[PDB]
Symmetry: C2
Subunit: 144 residues, 2 copies
Amino acid sequence: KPVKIGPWGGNGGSERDVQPKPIRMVSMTVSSGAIVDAIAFTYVGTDNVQHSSGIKWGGTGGTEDTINLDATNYVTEISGTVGKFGTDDIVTSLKIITSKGVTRTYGSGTGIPFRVPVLDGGKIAGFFGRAGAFLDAIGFYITP
Amino acid sequence: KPVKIGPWGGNGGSERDVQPKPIRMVSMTVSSGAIVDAIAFTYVGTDNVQHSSGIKWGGTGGTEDTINLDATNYVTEISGTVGKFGTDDIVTSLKIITSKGVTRTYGSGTGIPFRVPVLDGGKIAGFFGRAGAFLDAIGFYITP
């Protein structure tokens, strides 16, 4: 069963979550440009079945990038910033680090930093948050 | 069973951890004044036995304050700040929130904030980190 922590960001947009909850992440897709426009992911649930988060959480801007994950290549740390974009506090940048040390950076924005490093073979299993035109807020599911 | 995340803080101090790992926190004691001088806790381990973290993690400054906890009165969120105090980046403040609404604030908010809100009945079960004269860095064990 995952732990659920967060989210980091503003209170705009609509709330986003998944059912069933995730125990490991299979892929994630971030849409980004100057800031983080949207996120989507696929995962194995608490039922040991694969599921999608469905339509991307956020708007139509930016470009998509997908990370494929497996038992040896999993997300061990996520960081980012919360800042203004227009009059909304949103996720202005996001950085993903995997267990092989590869880092991907999404957005070029600034603001109040957040960072969640997961230790001892634990992993980020998936996401929840808030989104509208952009990614207002992001939180994490984590399994040991 | 717990997830292990963090730490937040500077790079100084000696590494501090507990064995066995915690599944429930029973009490925690923060020593603080202007900053966070030390932390200690007692917990139920993965062996279903009560254990201490031992001597406090940090120095002899500040005043001690103890929170008593159990399965239904648990820490649901910890936040704080990491900042320079003298020559060291340390945990300059901590805020503890319990499931019953008990709040305690320790130290002074100088530097960069962090927050770990735990949702859906998850709980902070204990701590690890780095310490010397002060609490250099703090991380969490979290159970779902």
